[PDB]
Write a protein that binds this ligand. Structure first.
Ligand SMILES: Nc1ccccc1N1CCOCC1
Ligand SMILES: Nc1ccccc1N1CCOCC1
Ligand SMILES: Nc1ccccc1N1CCOCC1
Ligand SMILES: Nc1ccccc1N1CCOCC1
Ligand SMILES: [Zn+2]
Ligand SMILES: [Zn+2]
Ligand SMILES: [Zn+2]
Ligand SMILES: [Zn+2]
Lengths: 360, 360
C-alpha cells in the first residue's frame, strides 16, 4: 500500500471513530455531527500533509531495516498515520485560531474557517479548541496500551506549549518589549531595535519549527521504538535549522509571490511583522533607507506598502538570501552526517525532509 | 496549615515554576514574563476557588482516616493543590475564550481579559491557549513519577473535551438543529422546539458539570489513591445532578440578580440562550404567552427584554424552582446515601460540595 493512500484512509477511520464516539458517548445529534465532520474536513484537509506524512516516512525508513511480523509492520504504519493526523489536527487548531487572531481572510485559496457564513468567530474559537482536543482523544484511543504513549504525550504537550509561546513571540514582535503592559494599548515600535536575526530566530524556532519539523521526526522515532538510533540533540538542531529556512521562504513569498499562487493576499508589511525581509533589510540599509522604511512600514496605505516593496527590491535581498541558503545547506549537510554515526536510515529521512523543503 | 493558605501558596510556587521555566528553557525575556504573570493572575485569581479547593477537601477527608507518614500527608496535600490549580487554570482557559466568543464585557466586576487595553483579542485567544497548556506542564512536572499520572491525564483530557462539546451545544442552542450548516448563516429558532428540559440538561451536563463537579471530585480521589472507595457511576450521577442545579441557579441570577452583585450585566435574553427560565416558562405558558415570548426573545431592544422579564415574573417561575430544588434535594440525598455503602468519608465530601452549592 502506498503511503499517502494509507494516510488518507486512516483519516476516514479516525473521523468515523471520533464522530461515532460523539454519538455513542456525548449525546450528539446528527446535525451537529455533520457540522463537526464538515469542520474537520475543511480545517484538516487540502494541504500537502507534509507534517503527518513525515511521521509515516520516518516509520517506513525503519521498517525497511528492522525485523518484524507483517502484523507488526501494519500496526507501526497505522500508528505512524494516527500520529501524523494528531500533528495535522494540531496544525489545524493553530491555523483556525491564528486566522481569527490575525483577522485573516483566506488560507490556501479558500476563506478562513471563521469567515464561513454558518460558523462565525463565536463557533470557530471553540471549533479550534475541539480540533486540539481530538488529538488527545486519538492518542488515548489508538495508543492506550502502547509503550511509547507516555513519551508521545509528553513530547506533544511540550511541542504544543512551545508553539503557543511562539505565537506570543510573533504577535508581540512589533511592540517594544519594555512597553508590554496589559493595562496600556501597545504602540508599534519606532526604532525597530528588536528586528534582529536573533530575535527573528526566536520567533520562528518556537512558532513553527517545533510542530513542523521536530514533532514529525521525533513522533516517527517514537512509533518505531527507535529513539535510541539517534542523538536527540542532533535531531533538535537539524529540526530547528530546517524549520527556520522554511519560514524564511514563507516570509519572502508573503511579499513577492502573486496572491492567486500564494493562496492569500500577503499582509506582513501592513501588519509590521518581524519578517526575514525586514530584518535583513535593516541589517544592510543606510541611514536614509532606514528612515524611509520607518516612515512606511506597518501601514495599510497601499502607497506605503509599495514603498517598502520598492525598498526591499532595490536592496538586493536575493543576495542575502542565496548567502543564507548556502550556509543552511552547509549546516544541514553537516548535521545529516553527524546523524549517520548512529542511524543511516534516520539520516536519510532527514535528507528527504530537507529536499522537500529546499526544492518547493 | 489551613487549606486555603496552602492552596494559595502553591499558586505562588506553581507560577514561579512556570515563569522560571519560560526563562531557562523557552528563551523568554523579562517583559513577556511579566505580561504572562499578570495574565495568569488576572485570569486565575479572584474567584472563590470552589473547584480547586474541592480537590483539597476530598484529599483532606481521606487523610483523616488513612495511615500515612507526615511527609506522605504533605505530598498528597501538595498534589491536591497542584491538581486543584490545573482545574482552576482549565476554567480560566474556558472563561477567557468564552468571553471572547460571546463578546462579553465584564466578568466578576472587572473587564474581560481580552478587553484590557494592552491585550486585545489577538493576544487573548493565544493567552487562553497558554492557560490550558500550563495545566499539562504542571501535571508532567509535579506528577512525573506518580502512580495516578496516567489516570489523571486521561480524566483531564476527557473532561476538557466534554467541556468543549458543551460549549458547542451552548453556542448552537438557539439555532434549529436541522438548519446547522457551515455554509449558511444561522437564523434564530422561531418555534423554540428545542427549548426542552432534556436539551437543556444536555447543554449543562457537558458545558459545566464535568469540569465544575466531576473533575474536582474524581481528581481528589486520584491524588488520594482512593478511586476504589467509590462506585464511579454514583460519583458521575451526583456530579451531573449537583452541577445542573448550579447552572439553574446561575440562569435565574442572570435575569434577576442586580448587575453590581451579579458582577456582570446579564444578557441571556438578548442572546436567546436556552436558559432554565426560558425552558420552564415554555413548559407552562399558554398560547398567548408563547406568542408574546416569541415576539420579544433574543432581541437587544430593552423594551423587549423587559417584556420577557415581565413574562417570567408573571409566570410564577419561583414555584417551578422550589419544585425543582426539592427534587434535586431528594436525589442528591439518595446518592449520598448510596455513596456511604463504599465510603462514608467520600460521601461526606459530596455533602459539603452540595451544601456549598445549595446555600450560596
Ligand atoms: N530478517 C532480519 C533479521 C534481523 C534483522 C533484520 C532483518 N531483516 C533484514 C532484511 O530486511 C528487513 C528484515
Ligand atoms: N518544548 C520542547 C519540545 C520538544 C523537545 C524539547 C522541548 N524543549 C526545548 C526548549 O525547552 C525545553 C524543552
Ligand atoms: N494508625 C492507623 C493504622 C491503620 C489505619 C488507620 C490509622 N489511623 C487511624 C487514626 O487516624 C488516622 C490513622
Ligand atoms: N467525558 C468524560 C469525562 C469523565 C468521565 C467520563 C466521561 N465520559 C462520559 C460520557 O462520555 C464518555 C466518557
Ligand atoms: Zn498569526
Ligand atoms: Zn507568512
Ligand atoms: Zn458562552
Ligand atoms: Zn450564565
Amino acid at each position: 500500500m502506498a503511503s499517502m493512500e494509507r494516510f488518507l484512509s486512516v483519516y476516514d477511520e479516525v473521523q468515523a471513530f471520533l464522530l461515532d464516539q460523539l454519538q455513542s458517548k456525548y449525546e450528539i445529534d446528527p446535525n451537529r455531527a455533520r457540522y463537526l465532520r464538515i469542520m474537520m474536513d475543511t480545517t484538516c484537509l487540502g494541504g500537502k500533509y507534509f507534517r503527518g506524512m513525515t511521521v509515516v516516512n520516518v516509520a517506513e525508513g525503519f521498517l525497511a531495516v528492522t525485523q518484524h511480523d507483517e502484523a507488526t509492520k501494519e500496526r507501526i504504519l497505522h500508528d505512524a498515520c494516527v500520529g501524523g493526523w494528531m500533528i495535522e489536527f494540531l496544525q489545524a487548531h493553530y491555523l483556525v485560531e491564528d486566522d481569527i487572531m490575525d483577522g485573516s481572510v483566506m488560507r490556501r485559496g479558500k476563506p478562513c474557517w471563521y469567515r464561513f457564513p454558518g460558523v462565525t468567530t463565536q463557533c470557530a474559537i471553540n471549533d479550534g479548541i475541539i480540533l486540539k482536543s481530538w488529538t488527545q482523544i486519538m492518542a488515548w484511543h489508538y495508543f492506550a496500551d502502547r509503550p511509547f504513549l507516555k513519551d508521545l504525550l509528553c513530547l506533544f504537550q511540550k511541542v504544543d506549549y512551545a508553539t503557543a509561546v511562539g505565537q506570543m513571540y510573533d504577535v508581540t514582535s512589533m511592540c517594544d518589549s519594555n512597553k508590554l503592559d496589559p493595562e496600556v494599548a501597545q504602540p508599534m515600535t519606532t526604532d525597530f531595535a528588536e528586528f534582529t536575526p536573533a530575535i527573528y530566530k526566536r520567533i520562528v524556532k518556537y512558532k513553527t519549527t517545533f510542530y513542523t519539523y521536530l514533532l514529525p521526526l521525533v513522533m516517527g522515532l517514537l512509533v518505531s521504538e527507535a529513539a535510541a538510533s539517534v542523538e536527540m540533540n542532533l535531531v533538535e538542531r537539524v529540526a530547528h535549522l530546517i524549520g527556520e529556512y522554511f519560514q524564511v521562504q514563507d516570509d519572502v513569498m508573503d511579499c513577492f509571490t502573486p496572491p492567486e499562487q500564494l493562496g492569500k493576499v500577503g499582509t506582513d508589511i501592513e501588519d509590521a511583522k518581524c519578517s526575514w525581509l525586514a530584518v535583513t533589510f535593516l541589517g544592510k540599509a543606510n541611514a536614509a533607507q532606514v528612515a524611509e522604511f520607518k516612515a512606511n512600514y506597518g501601514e495599510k496605505d497601499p502607497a506605503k506598502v509599495a514603498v517598502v516593496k520598492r525598498l526591499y527590491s532595490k536592496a538586493n535581498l536575493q543576495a542575502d538570501f542565496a548567502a543564507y541558503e548556502a550556509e543552511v545547506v552547509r549546516e544541514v549537510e553537516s548535521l545529516i552526517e553527524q546523524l549517520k554515526v548512529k542511524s543511516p536510515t534516520f539520516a536519510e529521512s532527514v535528507a528527504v525532509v530537507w529536499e522537500k523543503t529546499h526544492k518547493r
